[PDB]
Amino acid sequence: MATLAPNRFFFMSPYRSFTTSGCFARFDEPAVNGDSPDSPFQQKLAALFADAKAQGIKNPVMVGAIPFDPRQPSSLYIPESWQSFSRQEKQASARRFTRSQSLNVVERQAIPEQTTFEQMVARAAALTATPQVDKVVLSRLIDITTDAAIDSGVLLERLIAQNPVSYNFHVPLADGGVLLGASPELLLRKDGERFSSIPLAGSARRQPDEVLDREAGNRLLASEKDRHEHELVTQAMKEVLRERSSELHVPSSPQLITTPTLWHLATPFEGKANSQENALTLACLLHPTPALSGFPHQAATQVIAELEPFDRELFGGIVGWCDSEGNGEWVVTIRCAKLRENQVRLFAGAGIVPASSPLGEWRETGVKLSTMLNVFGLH
Numbered sequence: 001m002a003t004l005a006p007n008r009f010f011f012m013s014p015y016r017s018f019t020t021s022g023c024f025a026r027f028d029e030p031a032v033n034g035d036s037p038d039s040p041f042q043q044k045l046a047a048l049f050a051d052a053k054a055q056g057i058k059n060p061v062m063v064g065a066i067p068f069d070p071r072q073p074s075s076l077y078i079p080e081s082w083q084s085f086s087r088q089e090k091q092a093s094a095r096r097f098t099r100s101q102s103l104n105v106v107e108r109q110a111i112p113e114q115t116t117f118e119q120m121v122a123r124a125a126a127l128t129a130t131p132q133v134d135k136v137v138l139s140r141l142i143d144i145t146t147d148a149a150i151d152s153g154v155l156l157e158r159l160i161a162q163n164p165v166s167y168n169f170h171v172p173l174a175d176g177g178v179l180l181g182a183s184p185e186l187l188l189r190k191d192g193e194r195f196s197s198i199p200l201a202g203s204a205r206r207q208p209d210e211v212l213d214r215e216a217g218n219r220l221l222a223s224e225k226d227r228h229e230h231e232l233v234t235q236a237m238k239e240v241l242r243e244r245s246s247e248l249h250v251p252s253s254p255q256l257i258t259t260p261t262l263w264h265l266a267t268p269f270e271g272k273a274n275s276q277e278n279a280l281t282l283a284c285l286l287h288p289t290p291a292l293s294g295f296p297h298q299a300a301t302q303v304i305a306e307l308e309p310f311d312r313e314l315f316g317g318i319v320g321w322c323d324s325e326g327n328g329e330w331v332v333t334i335r336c337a338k339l340r341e342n343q344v345r346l347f348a349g350a351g352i353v354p355a356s357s358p359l360g361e362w363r364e365t366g367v368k369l370s371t372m373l374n375v376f377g378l379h
């Protein structure tokens with residue numbers, strides 16, 4: 001009953017699921033202007049890829065995470081090797097994994113707490129009613145200190161068991177840490193010439209019984225707050241993708257998708273892109289989406305910087321991989337945690353427009369945090 005070592009990358013996806021071994025070269029280069037092959041980011045990336053193939057490695061991948069603010073340094077690296085696994089096989093082994101960790105929390109801190117958060121929500125809702133911004137997303141944290149170092153392998157087993165369907169990731173950080181999570185949001189898949197993105201925005205709690213549950217979702221489909229929330233996201237990426245895609249299909253209405261925790265509204269984007277493009281050039285172009293920063297992007301970037309009493313770092317960024325041949329997959333870094341020794345930080349954001357109530361968003365972010373609290377066996 002072996003668990004994953006904290007110095008391995010792991011990625012579980014309906015596209016490609018693999019683990020990695022060892023480390024060839026680290027890659028800290030900021031991803032800013034990564035949507036443009038003339039960028040130092042892409043150049044150094046290309047260099048490092050040719051460097052790696054010249055050095056003997058067949059089929060190099062670049063795995064890891066990129067922070068919310070792409071000016072900041074990146075958590076990417078080429079492993080020595082990688083090894084495919086069966087997503088379904090893994091779901092099954094995880095569900096049978098029995099041996100846990102007795103873990104006692106010695107501190108639990110909400111940052112910020114209910115009252116401050118509600119004022120941040122009120123002050124942001126009001127700025128979206130004005131001409132300055134239409135949508136800002138605001139987040140909060142839960143910091144947890146435990147009395148023994150947290151085994152990240154056992155926790156990954158639990159996360160998979162509780163979240164069989166999501167993009168489940170486990171990434172080694174340059175400090176000795178681990179970024180760990182169960183993301184439902186595809187930011188960018190590129191499979192040959194073909195690409196897709198599946199933005200989410202708008203949520204409703206799921207219910208214990210499949211009658212009051214199957215309508216909670218129907219209600220989400222009707223909800224105008226959430227539908228407007230959602231529309232703000234899709235129009236933005238349409239425009240951005242306009243002169244970057246050969247062809248492009250986007251439904252004008254969202255569809256329901258599930259989390260063990262949440263109903264969300266989704267819009268799948270499908271398209272083809274030029275050979276001038278790769279998984280990262282496209283992922284950099286799209287992220288962050290109005291689902292994670294706001295609209296307009298840079299104007300919401302500033303509200304966020306003045307309201308949030310912390311730095312997001314890797315939270316609200318993207319995690320995934322890309323190869324030397326333009327392929328890859330990138331998911332949004334949400335429903336996640338950073339672990340290092342006996343310290344964990346959880347993250348969740350919403351979801352703010354003129355029609356949002358501060359209690360509403362506080363409790364929403366609450367349900368989103370519970371994906372990762374459940375992995376820890378907390379409430």
Ligand SMILES: C=C(O[C@H]1C=CC=C(C(=O)O)[C@@H]1O)C(=O)O
Pocket residue numbers: 137185200201202203264291292334335347348349350351352368
């Ligand atoms: C910022 C998060 O999720 C986005 C994804 C789906 C729905 C969202 C929402 O309804 O507000 C969020 O914008 C998070 O889970 O922390």
Ligand SMILES: [Mg+2]
Pocket residue numbers: 127128129130131132133134135
């Ligand atoms: Mg406005």
Ligand SMILES: [Mg+2]
Pocket residue numbers: 201202203229350351352364
């Ligand atoms: Mg929301």
